[PDB]
Write a sequence for this structure.
């Protein structure tokens, strides 16, 4: 599977997601952005079955954007994540289920807290300081259990991810072509374009 | 065939009004008056039970004030039975919203939904519209205390104070005169009663002919509380405001 | 008030269904047609007006077979008669499909009856503009029926309908009195030809063609067969000889 | 299951054993496999109990409606209704049904309806897992137009052989006798038929 | 074939009246009188059995019906409309309640369901309102005893005592005189019997009066023993004899 | 304003004209009928009138065998009568299948009465112009008469009558029952109960009947049948031998 | 599961054990395998516990409505015909094996129903994993014309055979008696031959034994 | 009288008439004329086509249904398109399923039954077109007249449309002569064109005005228009 | 493979003297990988407490479903749902999905606000009710729980004694299950108050 990593610090949520897209025997692409923006202060990363992955994410983005216009308001991360969970939980007993796992990273402008939600294809949502889907946790969780502090700056966050990615590039057998990293805070969503040699 | 007997409930007049809506509003105008007043720290709903009897049970009754949510309530003017159909769907809508988003439904979203349902009976289906007007009182953490009104047309509007049912002309004039933006719930209660008292078609305004409710922010808490006044509690509040 | 006659399933104040009564007018206006029960079968005959030399003779056949053993003839709106015979065919196929044996005549009668009655139950359908005379041979005898637009039907000794119906009915009644022990199949065919000719008096302005069919245990083996050539001519003669 | 129906001079006799097993365990030793779908039209059931029961129950229903509208149905009609169900649902049923009836015009008739849903009119018919053992015997001893007691005897000997060899058959021999006289129920206990 | 009447047969007239509902209430007015009285430990509902022939057997037509073991109904107006409503009421008590929560609905709720069925006949395509008014009496653990009226429009009101039908204005006056919050069931039976006497011209006996109560649990009327928590129905129809006993003491 | 007379909606009086008018149609055939209960049988008697000489008399009937146990006599036009007979037969057959016993007379009555009530309420269905008298010897209730009408009304009866001269027959029977003080005809044979029924029809209608002027149905334990011309004749001979 | 049904001269009795298991583990030691369809028609069930309870109440509920519609006491043949038709429709997927018994205006009845919807009639019947143990006792002691007390004994003895000999069954015996004159008597825990002996020791803990991290008051009110 | 009963096809008049149907029949009478006639070997349709302006084309009136069957129309042209389209499918079905050329008699029975359904049901209307169907099948040459009431008649020849009575009498008079024109296509057509000339009143039948079709023993149904009818004026 | 064993987790309920207690672990795993130590499996609708073990997505759904249904209940009935009633509601809700069931082992605990009777019940994935008088167990260490409860339990304990018993039953069961633990929580429930205590346990 593709790498889907997330960490919530003092004042922001950071998502890191692998760049590779492999189809069988060849790496078709090494710059893929495994993410949609749902609303100005909510970002979603995603990994799983080839077509369903982007189809699901754009379907969620479209609904949130509709809600935003209808109500001229931005749903709270918790509210967006519940919607997303309900959608996956519907999908699991349907004819052909979306096999998509997601991280939702949002900055709640009404609470002034960052929030990170992990939801798998079954619709199993949990709220966490850090998370991943697939094999990613197996390599990174012991590092995060060790170094993680709730009062970390965004700068400290990125350093801890750098470590996590290093471990992944040493022990995980697949070349995932690195990660695109994104930060979600009170000012919205920006991409760190200097992670390659940060 | 059947075409002969079709009243055509959903057509325009040559003037461009909807007969059935107009006639349903005409029905509502004869219904016991209901009043909503919005304060900085609360909302009041007051409604007048039209014609009663000594033998009518008042302890096991609530015919004009209905709870939609923990945070939303309505007062009804028109056909009670029609109103229950609508109230029930509105209670369902609120819980679907809660299930979907883990947040109570913002008041406008619930009022719009109900209004949409009414508008449909206006445009398709050849059924008569619902003979019902609502006053909505509710709270959410976006616009705080809100007060809305909807009628058979499916139009809704927001209000600082409003009446539906009988004598609304008279009641609105009285509300416009004595209502001020800095009012507190306790004054609002009083205004509501006064206004009903001057607009009744009865001799006097006794406790048994009233329903009363408030949505306050329980002063020892930090969160919102809805109180449908018990027959005793109406009797009490009617003496405090000096109408014994 | 009035207007009871404008819509199909509507009872008038005296308990009648006027549309059905009007359907009967369409029948009376039609060609005359008859059936005569004999001691081991049934014979059907009809009057076929020749509007012009241009109509291929023998060709526009009016009598219809249902299954293998049932014959039907009708006066009125012809397309209606066809529709009714189509249904009779489905209805008999269905019975044979499930029960293996070909449909008994009384059973078959009722099938048509229920369907015709059905068309006086609603204002989205018009009643049938025919009376149908039909019959055959089954496991226990021969049966002749006539079925009205109201869905009414009975078993007949002989039966007639259409413009010429009183002459036919009078002729038929004679036969019953003069042969109380039963008429034979050959006999009934001749007699049939007669009564059509005699009934032809009330429409004598146009020329006509005669059509006969029969279903007899001994003569046709319980199967419905048309009368052609020699036996047809012989009956035409018997009637020409008795018109003078 | 061992079942058969035999037409004779005066009408028809149905016969059956009384055993229903689930595996080697006898779930019922007193089963009545002779089922009434009309006053004088009966059947013997083999195959699935639930299937054959459900079918019989529907046929009883159809012939009760038929009778209301068209009087008494023929035995051929009863066989046809059974066939329609069996043939049309051959994928979902396991039913081997012998239809036997008495008609005043037609005397005794027998229709066998094997697994596929086909109909076969026959002078007599044997079915059920015990029947294989009595093909030779039945074919050698059946004659047309036997008397009531000759027919009863022939059924009794036949079924006692089938029961002797089939572990899926046993218990009592039941018979239903269908004639102009009415409807007679016979039973024969092991102590009697075992020693034939 | 096919119902082509998918439009309302009840609409608003220019004055705001709903004609068909008004007309149905008028059918109710012509109906034989029925009434209900709530006591501290029971409820009584009662009406006149008014036979169409003395050849009819009036015990075969029941005007007072059990809906659940604790809820009963009576009507004024069109008899056949009542009968089908009772069918639908009984069923909905199961499908909308008992099959979900394992218990019989409380009175106000079941009334609510009946009301809904009534309201819909006032709005759906191609039907007319029901020509009846119902009085529903019943008991439940959490609300005690209650008595409700349901009108053709689907409106329902709770009552201490009321009457509906032909002599309803006279009888509601008679009832206001005699009612208090301290009546025991037998006292209410007594008042019912008196109130009804004014409406009946003909014979007034246990054979021409139908009357039922919602009182105590009748374990003798349950049909089984062994489950301590099932005590029997609270609905009991009085017998011809029981009624007559109370008339000599009149 | 004046369409409340064409479909089944309320008149401003609260009446349903279409239902009243449907009652009027039940008299269209000008046939009377009456039902009585024996000790252990039930008898329906109905006038048989064959005006046309062209008719096969054997096919003219308003008595129907609905189930082995239930019989039904109709007052009203034959097409609506047969519509009702077919339905009741289907309903009786289904009940047996679904619930494992024979549909009781009163139950079938309620079912037919409910169907009739629907036509009373839905606009697209017209009421049937018929009155249905159902008879049996119920296994729980004994000899039973239940009669339904276009209004959806039904009730049980000691005995009953229906048709243009309904009233005369009714008062005749009412009088008998005031005298006899019981709710049935005290006779062990049904033959005598048929005899009674025919007698009291003669006294009420003031008319003599021949074997072809009548039509008789009898219900007993587990059978309902109708009498032939010849079985009626035998009843007619017997009545005449006491005068 | 061991369940039995025994006819007597004036009625019918049914009984059941009270063990409920998931695999080899005993989930409930006192569960109710005896079900009421109406006051005088009771059902004993084996197979899937949710199915026997659900199918009993669905039919029961319709029987109630049917009874009210027809003004007649429910019959056993009605419950039987309704149960089998439902069971059949679902092709064996509703795992209800039932012994259905009762008294009605036509007499006293005893039948069985298999999950696929076949039915049987009998004077004595058993179903369940204790079926064979029970039937051994029934085939051994049943006679025509039992008295009520004889029948309760025989039934109770058959369930016992199951309790002792079948690992699928244990704990107590529940009985229900339906006699033609009378009310149905349901005797829950008619026999309780499996009382647990007193333990060797008490396991009550010294208070404070358990390490607590945080304590809070939960709000029930509003 | 007529006032109240002509609202739809589901209503009978008190004299037993169906006005909507008769109103449909009237669209035929206002249609342009057309004639059909047959011998024992061929059948012929001849039709007068009508235009709107000298600027417009002449509207077609003959439609082929199969290789052995076709028709001409008078009245609402779209209705003919619907009915001929149905008839095309019926012919097709006979061929695909039974490998059989559909009999002209049967095709007439099907059209009668289709038309009839639209005269008993609420909300539909009758067809407002009349049809003349010719064909050569296993029983030789045939001609049919279809009326929107559902009456289909088998005739030696006929005409429908405005002033169709001219052609109809001419045909009634010529019966014994044209019925015998066997083995001669051109001669049967000439008999048709003469009969249609009896119904003219307006003007004379020109090259792009006249439409002829034929079907027979060794001739598949073919339609002549343009200079291909010149030889017949 | 087995949807009842993917996520892990346990719930246990016990009756005492005028009180009930219901307890659960806090683990949510994805097979061998522990995912959350904060996954509470006990919920409440007024005074009725429901614990749910099994497939997490179904646990969440069912809670949201029962909140929905009890909310509507309170509005129509004008009173809070009782444990007896709620149990029936859980039962019929589960059976509605008979051939597509939620993968769960629900447990109900509460005190009947009218009678003051203590009440517990257990259900299978298709809604069969087990109304034990003593204790109910559920989850991936239920075998272990049955063993603990059958020895540690005695009738009529006092709230603070029941607390020790249920806690010890839970902790020692979870410690013999790979898929339970990571925290525990115990509710002690009386007529008028309800206390919730988080336990200290090993984190492996």
């Amino acid at each position: 599977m593709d790498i889907i990593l997330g960490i919530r610090v003092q004042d922001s949520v950071i998502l890191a997601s692998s760049k590779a897209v492999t189809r069988g025997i060849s790496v078709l692409k090494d710059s893929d952005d495994k993410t949609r923006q749902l609303s100005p202060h909510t970002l979603m990363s995603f990994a799983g079955e080839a077509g369903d992955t982007v189809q699901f994410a754009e379907y969620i983005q479209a609904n949130i954007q509709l809600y935003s216009i209808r109500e001229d308001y931005e749903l709270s991360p918790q509210a967006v994540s519940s919607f997303v969970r309900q959608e996956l939980a519907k999908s699991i007993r349907s004819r052909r289920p979306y096999q998509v796992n997601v991280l939702i990273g949002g900055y709640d402008k009404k609470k002034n807290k960052p929030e990170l939600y992990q939801i798998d294809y079954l619709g199993t949502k949990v709220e966490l300081p850090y998370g991943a889907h697939g094999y990613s946790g197996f390599y990174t969780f012991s590092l995060l259990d060790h170094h993680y502090r709730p009062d970390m700056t965004t700068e400290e966050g990125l350093d801890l991810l750098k470590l996590c990615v290093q471990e992944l590039e040493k022990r995980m057998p697949m070349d995932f072509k690195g990660v695109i990293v994104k930060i979600v805070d009170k000012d919205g969503i920006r991409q760190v374009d200097d992670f390659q040699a940060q | 065939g059947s075409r002969r007997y079709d009243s055509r409930t959903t057509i325009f007049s040559p003037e461009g009004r909807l007969y059935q809506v107009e006639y349903a509003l005409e029905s509502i105008s004869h219904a016991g008056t209901a009043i909503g007043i919005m304060a900085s720290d609360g909302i009041v709903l007051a409604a007048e039970r039209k014609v009663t009897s000594t033998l009518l049970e008042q302890d096991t009754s609530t015919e004009k004030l209905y709870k939609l949510n923990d945070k939303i309530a309505v007062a009804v003017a028109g056909l009670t039975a029609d109103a229950e159909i609508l109230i029930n769907t509105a209670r369902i809508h609120a819980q679907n919203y809660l299930k979907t988003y883990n947040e109570d439904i913002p008041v406008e979203i619930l009022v719009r939904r109900l209004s949409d349902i009414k508008q449909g009976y206006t445009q398709h289906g050849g059924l008569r519209p619902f003979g019902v007007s609502f006053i909505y009182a509710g709270y959410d953490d976006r616009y705080g205390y809100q007060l809305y009104t909807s009628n058979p047309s499916g139009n809704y509007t927001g209000w600082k104070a409003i009446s539906v049912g009988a004598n609304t002309s008279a009641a609105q004039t009285l509300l416009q005169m004595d209502y001020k933006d800095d009012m507190k719930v306790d004054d609002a209660i009083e205004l509501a009663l006064k206004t009903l008292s001057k607009t009744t078609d009865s001799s006097a305004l006794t406790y048994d002919r009233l329903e009363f409710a408030t949505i306050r922010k329980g002063a020892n808490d930090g969160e919102v509380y809805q109180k449908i006044f018990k027959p005793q509690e109406i009797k009490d509040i009617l003496v405090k405001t000096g109408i014994t | 008030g009035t207007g009871y006659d404008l819509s199909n399933s509507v009872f008038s104040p005296d308990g009648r269904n006027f549309q059905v009564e009007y359907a009967v007018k369409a029948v009376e206006n039609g060609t005359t047609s008859i059936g005569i029960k004999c001691n081991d079968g049934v014979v059907f005959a009809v009057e076929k007006l020749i509007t012009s030399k241009l109509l291929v003779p023998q060709k526009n056949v009016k009598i219809q077979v249902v299954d293998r053993h049932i014959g039907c003839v009708y006066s009125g709106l012809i397309p209606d008669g066809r529709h009714l015979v189509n249904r009779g065919r489905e209805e008999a196929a269905s019975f044979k499909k499930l029960y293996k044996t070909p449909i008994p005549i009384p059973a078959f009668a009722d099938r048509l009856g229920q369907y015709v009655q059905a068309h006086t139950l609603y204002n989205s359908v018009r009643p049938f503009g025919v009376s149908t005379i039909f019959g055959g041979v089954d496991k226990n005898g021969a049966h002749l029926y006539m079925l009205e637009p109201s869905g009414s039907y009975w078993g007949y000794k002989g039966a007639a309908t259409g413009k010429g119906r009183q002459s036919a009915k009078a002729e038929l009644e004679k036969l019953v009195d003069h042969h109380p022990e039963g008429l034979s199949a050959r006999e009934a065919v001749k007699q049939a030809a007669k009564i059509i000719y005699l009934a032809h008096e009330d429409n004598k302005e146009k020329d006509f063609e005669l059509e006969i069919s029969w279903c007899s245990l001994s003569e046709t083996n319980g199967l419905h067969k048309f009368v052609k050539g020699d036996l047809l001519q012989e009956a035409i003669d018997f009637a020409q000889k008795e018109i003078n | 299951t061992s079942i058969m129906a035999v037409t004779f001079k005066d009408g028809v006799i149905l016969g059956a054993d009384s055993r229903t097993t689930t595996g080697a365990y006898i779930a019922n030793r007193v089963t009545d496999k002779l089922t009434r779908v009309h006053d004088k039209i009966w059947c013997c059931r083999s195959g699935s109990a639930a299937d054959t029961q459900a079918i019989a129950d529907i046929v009883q229903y159809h012939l009760e409606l038929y009778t209301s509208q068209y009087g008494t149905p023929s035995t051929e009609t009863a066989a046809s209704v059974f066939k329609e169900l069996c043939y049309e649902n051959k994928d979902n049923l396991t039913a081997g049904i012998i239809v036997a009836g008495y008609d005043d015009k037609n005397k005794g008739e027998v229709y066998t309806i094997p697994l596929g849903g086909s109909v076969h009119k026959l002078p007599y018919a044997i079915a059920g897992s015990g029947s294989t053992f009595i093909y030779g015997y039945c074919d050698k001893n059946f004659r047309e137009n036997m008397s009531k007691e000759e027919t009863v005897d022939f059924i009794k000997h036949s079924l006692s052989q089938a029961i002797k060899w089939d572990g899926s058959s046993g218990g009592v021999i039941r018979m239903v006798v269908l004639t102009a006289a009415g409807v007679e129920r016979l039973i024969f206990y092991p102590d009697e038929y075992e020693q034939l | 074939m096919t119902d082509r009447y998918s439009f309302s047969l009840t609409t608003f007239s220019p004055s705001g009246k709903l004609g068909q509902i008004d007309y149905a209430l008028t059918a109710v007015k012509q109906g034989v009188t029925s009434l209900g009285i709530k006591a501290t430990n029971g409820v009584v509902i009662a009406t006149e059995k008014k036979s169409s022939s003395p050849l009819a057997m009036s015990e075969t037509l029941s005007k007072v019906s059990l809906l659940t073991p604790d809820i009963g109904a009576v009507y004024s107006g069109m008899g056949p409309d009542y009968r089908v409503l009772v069918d639908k009421s009984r069923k909905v008590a199961h499908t909308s309640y008992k099959r979900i929560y394992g218990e019989y609905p409380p009175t106000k709720l079941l009334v609510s369901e009946v009301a809904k069925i009534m309201q819909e006949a006032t709005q759906s395509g191609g039907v007319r309102p029901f020509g009846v008014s119902l009085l529903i009496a019943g008991h439940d653990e959490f609300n005690g005893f209650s008595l409700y009226q349901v009108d053709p429009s689907g409106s329902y009101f709770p009552w201490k005592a009321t009457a509906i039908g032909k002599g309803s204005v006279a009888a509601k006056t008679f009832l206001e005189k005699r009612w208090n919050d301290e009546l025991e069931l037998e006292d209410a039976i007594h008042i019912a019997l008196l109130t009804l006497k004014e409406s009946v011209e003909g014979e007034f006996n246990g054979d021409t009066i139908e009357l039922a109560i919602i009182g105590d649990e009748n374990p003798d009327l349950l049909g089984y023993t062994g489950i301590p928590t099932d005590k029997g129905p609270r609905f009991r129809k009085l017998t011809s004899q029981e009624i007559n006993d109370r008339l000599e003491a009149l | 304003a004046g369409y409340d007379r064409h479909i089944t909606i309320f008149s401003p009086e609260g009446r349903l004209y279409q239902v009243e008018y449907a009652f009027k149609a039940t008299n269209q055939t000008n046939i009377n009928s009456l039902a009585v209960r024996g000790k252990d049988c039930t008898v329906v008697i109905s006038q048989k009138k064959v005006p046309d000489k062209l008719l096969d008399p054997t096919t003219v009937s308003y008595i129907f065998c609905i189930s082995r146990t239930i019989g039904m006599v109709v007052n009203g036009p034959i097409p609506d009568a047969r519509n009702a007979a077919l339905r009741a037969k289907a309903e009786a057959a289904e009940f047996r299948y679904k619930y494992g016993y024979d549909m009781p007379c009163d139950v079938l009555a309620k079912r037919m009465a409910n169907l009739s009530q629907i036509y009373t309420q839905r606009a697209y269905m017209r009421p049937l112009g018929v009155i249905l008298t159902f008879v049996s010897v119920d296994e729980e209730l004994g000899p039973s008469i239940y009669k339904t009408d276009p209004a959806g009304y039904y009730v049980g009866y000691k005995a009953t009558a229906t048709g243009p001269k309904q009233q005369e027959i009714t008062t005749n029977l009412e009088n008998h029952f005031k005298k006899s003080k019981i709710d049935h005809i005290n006779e062990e044979s049904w033959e005598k109960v048929v005899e009674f029924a025919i007698t009291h029809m003669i006294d009420a209608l003031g008319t003599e009947f021949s074997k072809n002027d009548l039509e008789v149905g009898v219900a007993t334990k587990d059978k309902f049948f109708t009498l032939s011309a010849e079985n009626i004749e035998e009843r007619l001979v017997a009545i005449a031998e006491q005068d | 599961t061991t369940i039995v049904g025994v006819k007597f001269n004036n009625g019918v009795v049914i009984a059941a054990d009270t063990r409920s298991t998931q695999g080899p583990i005993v989930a409930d030691k006192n569960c109710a395998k005896l079900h009421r369809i109406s006051p005088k028609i009771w059902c004993a069930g084996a197979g899937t516990a949710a199915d026997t309870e659900a199918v009993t109440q669905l039919i029961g509920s319709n029987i109630e409505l049917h009874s009210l519609y027809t003004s007649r006491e429910p019959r056993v043949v009605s419950a039987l015909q309704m149960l089998k038709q439902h069971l059949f429709k679902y092709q064996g997927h509703i795992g209800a094996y039932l012994i259905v018994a009762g008294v009605d205006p036509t007499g006293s009845h005893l039948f069985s129903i298999h999950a696929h919807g076949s039915t049987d009639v009998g004077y004595y019947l058993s179903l369940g994993s204790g079926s064979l143990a029970a039937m051994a006792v029934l085939e051994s002691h049943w006679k025509q014309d039992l008295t009520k007390e004889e029948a309760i004994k025989l039934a109770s003895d058959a369930i016992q055979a199951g309790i002792w000999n079948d690992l699928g069954s244990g704990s107590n015996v529940d009985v229900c008696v339906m006699e033609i004159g009378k009310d149905a008597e349901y005797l829950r825990n008619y026999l309780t031959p499996n009382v647990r002996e007193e333990k060797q020791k008490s396991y009550k803990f010294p208070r404070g034994t358990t390490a607590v991290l945080k304590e809070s008051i939960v709000n029930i009110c509003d | 009288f007529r006032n109240n009963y002509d609202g739809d096809t589901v209503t009978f008049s008190p004299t037993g008439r169906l006005f909507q149907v008769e109103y449909a029949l009237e669209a035929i009478k206002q249609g342009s004329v057309t004639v059909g006639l047959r011998s024992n070997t061929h059948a012929v349709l001849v039709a007068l086509k009508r235009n709107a302006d000298e600027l417009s084309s002449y509207q077609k009136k003959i439609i082929k249904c199969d290789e052995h069957m076709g028709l001409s129309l008078a009245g609402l042209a779209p209705d003919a398109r619907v009915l001929s389209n149905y008839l095309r499918q019926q012919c097709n079905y006979s061929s695909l399923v039974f490998n059989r050329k559909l009999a002209v008699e049967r095709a007439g029975h099907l059209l009668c039954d289709k038309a009839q359904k639209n005269t008993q049901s609420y909300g539909g209307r009758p067809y407002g077109v009349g049809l003349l169907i010719i064909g050569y099948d296993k029983s030789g040459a045939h001609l049919l007249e279809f009326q929107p009431s559902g009456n289909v008649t088998e005739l030696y020849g006929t005409a429908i449309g405005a002033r169709s009575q001219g052609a109809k009498t001419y045909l009634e008079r010529t019966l014994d002569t044209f019925i015998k024109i066997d083995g001669n296509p051109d001669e049967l057509i000439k008999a048709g064109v003469e009969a249609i000339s009896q119904s003219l009143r307006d003007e004379s039948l020109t090259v792009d005005n006249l439409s002829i079709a034929i079907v027979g023993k060794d001739t598949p149904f073919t339609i002549y228009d343009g200079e291909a009818v010149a030889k017949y004026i | 493979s087995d949807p009842s064993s993917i996520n892990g987790g346990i719930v246990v309920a016990m009756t005492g003297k005028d009180c009930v207690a219901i307890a659960c672990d806090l683990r949510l795993g994805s097979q061998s990988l522990g995912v959350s130590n904060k996954f509470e499996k006990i919920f409440h609708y007024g005074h009725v407490f429901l614990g749910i073990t099994g497939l997490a997505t179904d646990v969440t759904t069912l809670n949201e479903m029962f909140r929905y249904k009890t909310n509507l209940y309170k509005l129509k009935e004008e009173r809070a749902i009782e444990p007896e009633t709620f149990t029936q509601l859980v039962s019929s809700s589960l059976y509605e999905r008979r051939f597509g069931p939620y993968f769960v082992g629900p447990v109900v605990a509460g005190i009947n606000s009218k009678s003051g009777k203590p009440f517990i019940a257990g259900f299978d994935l298709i809604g069969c009710i087990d109304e034990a008088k003593d204790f109910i167990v559920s989850g991936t260490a239920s075998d272990q729980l049955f063993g603990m409860c059958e020895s540690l339990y005695e009738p009529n304990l006092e709230p603070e004694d029941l607390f020790e018993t249920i806690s010890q039953a839970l902790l020692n069961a979870a410690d013999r299950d790979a898929l339970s633990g990571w925290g525990a929580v115990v509710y002690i429930i009386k007529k008028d108050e309800v206390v919730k205590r988080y336990l200290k346990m090993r984190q492996d």
